[PDB]
Symmetry: C3
Subunit: 306 residues, 3 copies
């Protein structure tokens, strides 16, 4: 596997969004604008990023703009270890075929950067009601259509074939209200896919934040880590008040939230986990917390691998 | 403007209160007692303080005691960048005229320390019911009297004239249940004041903590930052449980709470903000969290100004 | 007293539990297994540990296994400053006499390690319903039997006699729903015990986390610190929503929770507190947060003792 100091721990770029400081789309911005965003990430200690598809859209750039991007990525001291598609489901009713095609494009781009994972999930656009809430997860939004599960499996396998040929893997991001929205459902889904270049991304912070019953993360992670090839890793406080029935959660650094990631990262290692990490953190100071989380993971790994 | 390393980031002294370790009033204490309190602040890395009016009452000291204070302030490696009056409203029914007179005294004292802001707000004493709560903001206390708004504007302008003559500015601290207790109300108030030596202090942590509907801080800060000349800067987690209607909040470091202060400080800069900062943090380890917050702001500024 | 840099600040070992990585009991593990657990603690900066009775059971080991343990403790750069029995009440109906005997054994072992405290409390096993909750403290579990208070006092005194003879002291851990589950009850209990080698352990985080009315920690600590000889020191956010009646709490570093431990540690010192500290933190990254808490305490002490 990697050693602690070379294990990729990527900054997820979704917090930058896709608007340029001048008001247009980031896809059209001069490379120097991209460079200043990347610089903020390097300043906080990262070696790796995950550009997502919610920042500079690599699948959409011309080949010459890809090379402009490649130059500033290197100049700013960074590399891409994974590419995570966000709210771009391959079974979106309107855009699923486009999203599938973009996923294939990202599988071809990934090896050129040295990236080893393309990640997809079944989350879709936030609904208007979700956008009004203090956090989007406070109300249910998109719920996967049961009639499209077989299509989802077919398209996952198609992507996995391409990934395998390119020497990389596809990862499937666990997310609420989707085909892979509970530990048992995720396990059954990855077993049904039956593809040696596809694995889970156990982004269980997505579940721990929810105001609904949830098994303890120790139990959930033990189920899904054996099938995991990539890891969006974030934490939340979690609380409940039996007398009222109120739940609460707050995004927090890995060290401070409800999951014990010292125990869980060590468990992952024990279970043979070898995939890259990706620090995500919706809300709060997303980038600043991700940077603390990277340092945290590096200490945990250093101790566990010594 | 300032550079990142010279931008004043003051420790607010209100957490020391006004009781001396021996049991009397801090106003009567030997200068060495003041020195040991100041030393705790310097030990945590600050260059600047804001004494408030809730610690050593500078407006009340004799001139010779002011010089005693000035000596220990320098000896302990600190300087005053702003002076923030607390629960000392210039339209308090009993003490408003005294508070106005004290504000004028502070405007005369400020330049001697190199301070560039005197800050006033419309908060008043906590009520007995507020004092019984886990946090004072859990119940409504003082609510400004509509019949005194014109008097408030008149007295603000009077202070602003004095500030202008002294080469400094007055700032108006946003605080719930006052004339400047919502973004729109604060904007309308500063426009009505119509004075080029008066500005807002967008202490929006005061609002984010409240168990009531509140616009997202991105939206609120965008409205008020164009009018801001000083900044009490603090954060809170913020959560809500739709099924019960319960709200919750907890004081936290800037990096960890609901506001994204990386984005918001950069926005402020983009909007031409140049005033000093003041780290405030009611509850918890107020001084310790303020010290982390200062280091946080310095990193954000360093990156944004590089 | 101690100086800041020699004041013992122990890592509580209960978060390791008593299962060995291979699946058996830690009591049977090779010393090298113990060494790797101890190493994680030293890596995070500790000089001292409190083994508890929930990790390697020192009272149960043979004398030759004690010496095996002693060797790896030294090899890994650590020492024992206190031994805290957990859910091992000396008035447990089934196991009280065994627990009493084990407490005596620990009083004989403690001086050999240089430890100055053996700590006992009246908490008992978590109930099945407690084990199902998001946190055990969300539902009431064991409640002490009033008819056994006199027996408890008798057995405390018996332990205190032994402690005194051995040049150490017994501490009594405050914990909800026990004889010492409120400040007033703890004070009355320690006064009734009337023993100069017994004192309180004011683990008031145990109370601050609870979803019930609670006096402010300033008030509670002022009552119990005069009687305290040892200190399990942890923090929680604490919040309440009057409109719904919902409470919430989350384990957090000392610096970030509801108690102001800068003020409270300084108060302790003022009140003559001289006992060792023990960093405990149930849930979250227990060890990682304890390590930050140790650094925190060392800064507070350094400033207060300078
Ligand atoms: Mg994710
Ligand atoms: Mg303020
Ligand atoms: Mg304890």
């Amino acid at each position: 596997m990697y050693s602690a100091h070379t294990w990729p721990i990527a900054a997820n770029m979704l917090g930058f969004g896709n608007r340029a400081p001048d008001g247009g789309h980031i896809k059209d911005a001069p490379a120097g604008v991209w460079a200043k965003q990347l610089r903020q990430v390097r300043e906080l200690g990262f070696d790796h990023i995950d550009p997502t598809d919610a920042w500079v859209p690599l699948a959409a750039l011309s080949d010459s703009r890809i090379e402009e991007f490649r130059t500033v990525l290197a100049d700013e001291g960074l590399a891409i270890s994974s590419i995570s598609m966000t709210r771009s489901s391959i079974v979106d009713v309107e855009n699923g075929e486009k999203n599938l095609a973009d996923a294939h494009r990202l599988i071809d781009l990934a090896p050129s950067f040295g990236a080893t994972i393309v990640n997809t999930g079944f989350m879709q656009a936030l609904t208007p009601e979700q956008e009004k809430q203090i956090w989007f997860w406070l109300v249910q939004g998109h719920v996967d259509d049961p009639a499209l599960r077989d299509l989802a499996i077919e398209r996952v396998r198609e992507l996995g074939d391409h990934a395998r040929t390119n020497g990389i893997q596809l990862s499937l991001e666990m997310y609420e209200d989707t085909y892979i929205g509970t530990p048992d459902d995720a396990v059954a889904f990855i077993k049904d896919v039956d593809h040696d270049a596809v694995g889970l991304n156990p982004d269980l912070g997505n579940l721990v934040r929810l105001h609904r019953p949830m098994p303890h993360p120790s139990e959930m992670y033990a189920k899904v880590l054996p099938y995991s090839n990539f890891w969006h890793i974030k934490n939340y406080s979690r609380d409940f008040d039996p007398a009222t029935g109120a739940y609460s959660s707050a995004p927090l650094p890995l060290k401070y939230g409800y999951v014990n990631y010292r125990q869980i990262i060590r468990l992952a290692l024990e279970l043979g986990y070898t995939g890259p990490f990706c620090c995500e953190h919706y809300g709060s100071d997303s980038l600043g917390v991700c940077a603390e989380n990277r340092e945290y993971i590096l200490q945990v790994l250093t101790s566990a691998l010594a």
